[PDB]
Symmetry: C3
Subunit: 148 residues, 3 copies
C-alpha cells in the first residue's frame, strides 16, 4: 500500500508459545519494503507496546501511517496519545499475517537447530535472515536494501 | 557551528540522580544536525569517558572537532592522548546544556510512565525519541535524517 | 580482491586466550572495504558459526562470495547448506590474517587500559576503533565510510 519506505506500516501483537510460556511478539512491517522489526515481550501493556514501537522506529525510521487491529495494545490511551504527540496517524483497519508466519517459521527453525541458546538469540537470527539475507525477487534486493 | 555533520561536536558529562544513585551521563551532540549519543556510566574515569566517546562515534561517525568543558573527564592524559592518536582536535571552550535538559526530561517521563523497567531501557527510549521521532521543524526532518 | 563492498569476504575462526580461557573469535572482513565484524564465542559448532556469520551480515550486508580455511567451522554440512540456501558461494581457498592481528592488538590494549571491564566491552571498543576511527589513508576514509 505504501508508495515509499515509511509511508505506511502495519503492526500486530501475536503470541508465540515457547518453553511453556506465551510471549507477545510485537511486529512492525513496512508495507512498501517489507522490512520488519520484532520485539519479544512478557506483557502487552502500553509500556511494552510503545517500547516495541520505538525500537521499530529506531531500526526502520519514523512512519507517517500505521495500521493495526483492535487489540488492547493499540486501543490504550497511552499509545493513541503517543501517536498523536509525534504526528503518526493510526488507523485500526494480510501482510503482518504472513510476516508473523515467516518470523515464527524461522524462530521454530533456529530454536530447533540450537536448542540450548536463548530466545533473544533466535529472534535476532530470524530478523537478520528475513531483512538482510532473504533476496526478495525479482529485483534481487533484500528488504533492508529496498528500505534504505 | 558545524557546517556539516561531524564537523564539530560538543560533549559533556552531567549527573543524573535516580533510585538514590548519581549516574554520569556522557553526552555527545553534533552541532550541525543536533544528533545525540548518550551513555550512562557509574564512573567518569578515562576508561568510561573513552568508552562513551567510541560509542558516540559508533552511532554518529568520526568527528573532526570536539568541544568540552574542563571537567576531569576531558582533562585526563588518556583522553587527550586518545584524541591526538586518532586525529580529533579537542578544545575545552548552550547546545549540550539544552540537550542535557531535553534528555533528562525524557528520562524522567519514561521512568514515570514505566517505573518497573531498568534505566537502560529509558535511555534507549529517550535517545530514539530525540534522534528519530522528534521532527525538527521547519525542515520536517529529524536529527537522524539530517545527520545521515 | 572484491571490486565492490560485499563482492568478496574472507572469514576465519581464531583463538584468543584471556583470563585462562581460549575464546573463538569468528572474524569476517570485506576484501574491498576492509570493514570487519568480530564475534566472541565459547564454541565453534555450526550454531555459533552461523550465528557469527549472520551478525556479520547484519552489520555489513549480504556477501556474494566468502573465502575461508578448511577449519571444522566452515566444513560442517549445516554451514555449507546454510550458504547454498541463501545464494552465498563459499570457497575454502593474508587479509584475515592481518585483520586478526590488528583486532587482537586492540583487544590486548583495551583490556590493559581497563582491566576490570568485561571482554565484550573490549571487543566493541576494538571493532568501533577499527571500522570507524582508523582513517585508511590516503583516501582519508575509514573502513565504515568506504563500505557504506
Ligand atoms: Ca493481534
Ligand atoms: Ca560537566
Ligand atoms: Ca582458523
Amino acid at each position: 500500500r505504501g508508495l515509499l519506505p515509511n509511508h505506511i506500516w502495519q503492526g500486530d501483537v501475536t503470541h508465540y508459545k515457547y518453553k511453556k510460556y506465551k510471549y507477545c511478539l510485537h511486529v512492525w512491517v513496512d508495507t512498501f519494503s517489507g522490512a520488519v522489526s520484532v520485539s519479544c515481550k512478557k506483557k502487552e501493556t502500553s509500556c511494552e507496546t510503545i517500547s516495541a514501537f520505538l525500537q521499530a522506529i529506531s531500526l526502520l525510521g519514523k512512519p507517517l501511517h500505521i495500521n493495526t487491529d483492535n487489540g488492547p495494545a493499540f486501543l490504550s490511551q497511552e499509545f493513541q496519545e503517543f501517536c498523536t504527540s509525534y504526528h503518526i496517524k493510526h488507523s485500526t483497519h494480510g501482510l503482518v499475517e504472513r510476516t508473523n508466519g515467516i518470523i515464527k517459521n524461522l524462530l521454530n527453525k533456529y530454536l530447533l537447530d540450537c536448542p540450548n541458546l536463548p530466545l533473544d538469540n533466535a529472534i535476532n537470527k530470524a530478523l537478520w535472515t528475513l531483512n538482510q539475507l532473504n533476496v526478495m525477487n525479482p529485483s534481487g534486493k533484500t528488504r533492508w536494501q529496498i528500505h534504505h
